[PDB]
Design a binder for this molecule. Structure first.
Ligand SMILES: Oc1cncc(Cl)c1
Ligand SMILES: Oc1cncc(Cl)c1
Ligand code: NA
Lengths: 301, 306
């Protein structure tokens, strides 16, 4: 029993965290095989963050301008190239702790674990979701750029995020491990602001199914709803539209509890209208949207 | 910026988790040097669990009755002994991934990370607090017994918890690594219940300081109070008493934000009396009490442990 925002064990990722230094800038890199991946703004000075010309800054660098430190061993760089917004530093030594891994670009509403790091040394691990506005609500201080997000499935680590910057509202933006930003953001110190955030509707429904599974039914009701009527109500609370894809993804949790998806949608509608009335659901006094249908099946019965 | 329930990196502990089987019962063990630590109830059947005599049950078991699996390698048991409620299995091979470590016993209100495991295979990590009633609100399914709680300081893993059992309210109970239970619990299938819990006052205040550090300032007011006056409020709302020791501990946050502790207790006092009035604090409608003062400082400073 119980229900916790659970992260994946971080050990396979700890083994790949290194420190990358260019000039006065130091941040984190991801050492897989003989390549070290880090944000390309490691090569920007103070003067460059407004309108950096990355091709022009990088052509002026040679391999020995990059200091890569793994533990207290120094790694020697033997090549460097840029892919979108990530720098790829070829090093002379393959990481002996390299896990089985792949790179995956995730969709809004997907969750992952974050290993927050500073100076190539891991600080802590926590669970996050990619918000509908393509930001994440993380916990990052100066020096954490290059921290990475991941899932683990059967000892294979799927890397899906690397941290690049904090937006003015205190939320965080980054790229996949191919250097493509999530959302409309750029590695530039320009005025950019996240779109209005919305609640991940399909995750809330899954978290409600999770509450039924741990034995709580107080919020159910005898009503049902059409898909479109539910979406007309839910968008008035800044909830994401719920699609037929979302309905199918919830099929298994529906069957395990015996509550049709559109019936649980009716329950959510009433919860949005009533509030919780001093009760809690899985220990929370708000509707929780950072567990996915997959996460719920993982942690529950 | 940002504030998240944050666990320590679990790598040093992942390398110590092994599966331990004795009969049908199979659970998780902690492998350090040449000893495997696990709950002593691994030797009991469901019949035995109702009124076990552990030394009698243990005098009958022999080394070969303990199947220890470190991943895919079998470890061979060459000895067995019992310290309080944990069983110590001497094994033939020292663990090459043994980190620097200590066994420590924590206090109610202190936090720790839990590496949840199943068949000696780690599956998740999360952050927990020892509640004043000596339970933890974890997330465990069957097969989790033997999972361990820890803190990391510098290079050293401080082991503080190992999971033994779930209570009927859905919360969890365990021992330290020397086998002493947290709270008035016994390792037998009997009628056991968590006592009434209370809220960890010093932790709520720490979390209010984290909110101020992160720009949530709406609950601050012009008022102040005294330790005596506040503690009367705390007892009324089922909060732990606030001691002068607690105030001293909150010092580095009171200075760093400019809000004195009794100044912040004035805010907490109003929050307990008047409610939240529709607003949130750090994205929560509840007053969070599972961040210690050290947790707040360390997350809002940047301390790393390689
Ligand atoms: O470089 C930074 C990355 N993340 C957060 C901050 Cl406040 C700074
Ligand atoms: O054997 C168990 C231990 N802890 C929790 C559960 Cl639900 C079962
Ligand atoms: Na005040």
């Amino acid at each position: 029993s119980g229900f916790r925002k659970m992260a994946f064990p971080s050990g396979k990722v700890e083994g790949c965290m290194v420190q990358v230094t260019c000039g006065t800038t130091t941040l984190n890199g991801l050492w897989l095989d003989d390549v070290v991946y880090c944000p390309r703004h490691v090569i920007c000075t103070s003067e460059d963050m407004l309108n950096p010309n990355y091709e022009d800054l990088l052509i002026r660098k040679s391999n020995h301008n990059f200091l890569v430190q793994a533990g207290n061993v120094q790694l020697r760089v033997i090549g460097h190239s840029m892919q979108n917004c990530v720098l790829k530093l070829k090093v002379d030594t393959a990481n002996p702790k390299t896990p089985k891994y792949k790179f995956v670009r995730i969709q809004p509403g997907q969750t992952f674990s974050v290993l927050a790091c500073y100076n190539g040394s891991p600080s802590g691990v926590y669970q996050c979701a990619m918000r509908p506005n393509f930001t994440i609500k993380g916990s990052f201080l100066n020096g954490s750029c290059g921290s990475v997000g991941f899932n683990i499935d059967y000892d294979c680590v799927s890397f899906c995020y690397m941290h690049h910057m904090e937006l003015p509202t205190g939320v965080h933006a980054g790229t996949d491990l191919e250097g493509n930003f999530y959302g409309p953001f750029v590695d530039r110190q320009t005025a950019q602001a996240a779109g209005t955030d919305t609640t991940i509707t399909v995750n809330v429904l899954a978290w409600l199914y999770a509450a039924v599974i741990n034995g709580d039914r107080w919020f159910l009701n005898r009503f049902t709803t059409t898909l479109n009527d539910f979406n007309l109500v839910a968008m008035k609370y800044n909830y994401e539209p719920l699609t037929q894809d979302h309905v199918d993804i919830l099929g298994p949790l529906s069957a395990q509890t015996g509550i049709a998806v559109l019936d649980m949608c009716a329950s959510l509608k009433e919860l949005l209208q009533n509030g919780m009335n001093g009760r809690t659901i899985l220990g929370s006094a708000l509707l929780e949207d950072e567990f996915t249908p997959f996460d719920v099946v993982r942690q529950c019965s």
